[PDB]
Design a protein around this nucleic acid. Structure first.
Length: 184
RNA sequence: UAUUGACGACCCCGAUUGGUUCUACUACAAACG
């Protein structure tokens, strides 16, 4: 885009930026708050990992994505049980909230493996975070074990998954880059 | 029953270990005000 505003690069030099880029950077402040608020152990900023954790020799972007919700929602009329509108809304709504809670709860469990971890996106059935490298396969194993364990026990998912796939759980998968800290 | 009647060199290397252990990329420049 054309330049419209000025902002500061990571070196702190003033640079030309678009109004798109400018409003994104303005909002990163409210984002970093909300992500940290999930758990006090979390680090607010990649800069704050660099402050608090100079020992790090590696870093890992984790990206994790929930599985099957789209096909369930495309078919949810089958799975609500009683074929009535009032039940559809309730089941649809609670299922959607339940997966957000499962992702949050599974995340607050998994971080016990470390806290040198910065969340980037954390909501719905979808997670991505910057971990301490050489703790991310273990954090993601623990997260995916805890995401299943959450969706097993979480009543609002349990019965639907049973009718959808014959087991009372959902699943998620993860990509784990594992990167040296200055790498893009 | 125990006689016949003297010659002649050999060995030339043999057995075994034949790799073992550590370091396997490290900082960077692009990420981050």
């Amino acid at each position: 885009l054309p330049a419209s505003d000025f902002d500061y690069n990571a070196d702190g030099d003033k640079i030309p930026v678009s109004t798109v880029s400018k409003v994104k950077r303005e909002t990163a402040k409210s984002a970093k708050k909300r992500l940290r608020s999930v758990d006090g152990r979390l680090v607010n900023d990649l800069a704050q990992l660099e402050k608090s954790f100079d020992e790090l020799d590696w870093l890992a972007v984790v990206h994790a994505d929930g599985n099957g919700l789209g096909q369930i929602l495309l078919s949810l009329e089958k799975y609500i049980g009683e074929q009535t509108n009032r039940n559809y809304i309730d089941k649809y709504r609670r299922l959607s909230l339940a997966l957000d809670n499962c992702t949050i709860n599974a995340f607050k469990m998994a971080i016990a493996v470390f806290l040198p971890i910065v969340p980037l996106i954390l909501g719905g059935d979808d997670l991505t975070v910057i971990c301490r490298g050489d703790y991310a396969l273990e954090f993601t194993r623990e997260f995916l074990e805890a995401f299943e364990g959450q969706t097993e026990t979480h009543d609002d998912i349990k019965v639907i998954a049973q009718k959808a796939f014959g087991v009372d759980r959902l699943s998620a998968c993860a990509g784990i880059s594992i990167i040296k800290p200055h790498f893009p």
